[PDB]
Structure 1
């Protein structure tokens, strides 16, 4: 009647409800026992995410879960005999929702603005782009972002004028050739990709003005 922590992944597909664990009281030998659960996700909102079979004691989940909505449920199980007397003290059940990589990284803006002096030596820091990821950055790689440049417009004097640091999102002058007179602004297409650059991804824009 001890109960260990319980885990469920989010976004489970398939037939519902699904078994989590069978609750049991020792007093089952001396009398007939009925089981119940209380708390948010049980008898309070969100009602009915978790249910328990009153006779067998099977705790179940009734629907897919979403770790970015609710990462943890605290429930309580109850054990009542047919005479109407509690035969256990209500027992705490902790349900942890585990993560799936179901969120694309997301830039903090959709157009970032920076500027750079045409005279800047190659390897001069220009500006910083940034993305966030709603997935579990503490236990997984589902939120580990890597920045990349996708395209540059215009592609002149050539098409690698700038570079981005994949960890920090800092954009730097890659090569010399910046000519305000001949092209006054560059528009980069930047990409954030999770799983260390290898996962889901999104894009945004960075607009670079060449100063005097």
Structure 2
């Protein structure tokens, strides 16, 4: 039940975009084909597509510049699934503060 520390991203990033933020992976993907996805507002809920996660690497990226005066915090969950779509473990909550 370790909580991943919140990421802090300054607003007005000049990118380039997509801008790689941090790798979010499950140690077990090395010896088990895993698929990563992210869910939540900023991902698959309004606002949509501000954060994407590369399915095999778990590399999470931001797609455009942020604005702390519009949205100051994002809360997403990353998920890891096997070859048949079964989640191999509980989703990890991800907190992103726009600074």
User: Does TM-score exceed 0.5, indicating one fold?
Assistant: yes
The residue number in structure 2 matching 1:40 is 41
Cα deviation per residue 1:141-190 (whole Å; 9 max; x = unaligned)? Answer: xxxxxxxxxxxxxxxxxxxxxxxxxxxxxxxxxxxxxxxxxxxxxxxxxx
Q: Which runs of 5+ in 2 are unaligned?
A: none
Q: Which has the larger radius of gyration?
A: 1
* Contact residue 15 and residue 65 of structure 2 kept, 8 A: no
Q: TM-score, normalised by structure 1?
A: 0.44
Q: TM-score, normalised by structure 2?
A: 0.92
How many aligned positions are there?
98
Runs of 4+ in 1 over 4 A off after TM superposition: none
The residue number in structure 2 matching 1:140 is none
Residue 3 of structure 1, CA deviation: 2.6
Residues 101-120 of structure 1: pairs in structure 2 closer than 5 A? none
Residue 15 of structure 1, CA deviation: 1.1
Q: From the two aligned structures, give the one with the greater strand fraction.
A: 1
Q: Hey, what's the Cα distance between the residues in 1 that align with 2:45 and 2:15?
A: 25
Residue 27 of structure 1, CA deviation: 2.0
SS of equivalent to 2:49: coil
Q: 1:9 to 1:89 in 2, by over 3 A?
A: same
* Contact residue 27 and residue 87 of structure 1 kept, 8 A: no
1:6 aligns with 2:7: yes
The residue number in structure 1 matching 2:89 is 88
Q: Hey, what's the Cα distance between the residues in 2 that align with 1:2 and 1:56?
A: 21
* Contact residue 7 and residue 96 of structure 1 kept, 8 A: yes
* Higher relative contact order structure (alpha carbons within 8 Å, sequence separation ≥ 6): 2
SS of equivalent to 1:16: coil
Q: Hey, what's the Cα distance between the residues in 2 that align with 1:58 and 1:90?
A: 15
1:52 aligns with 2:53: yes
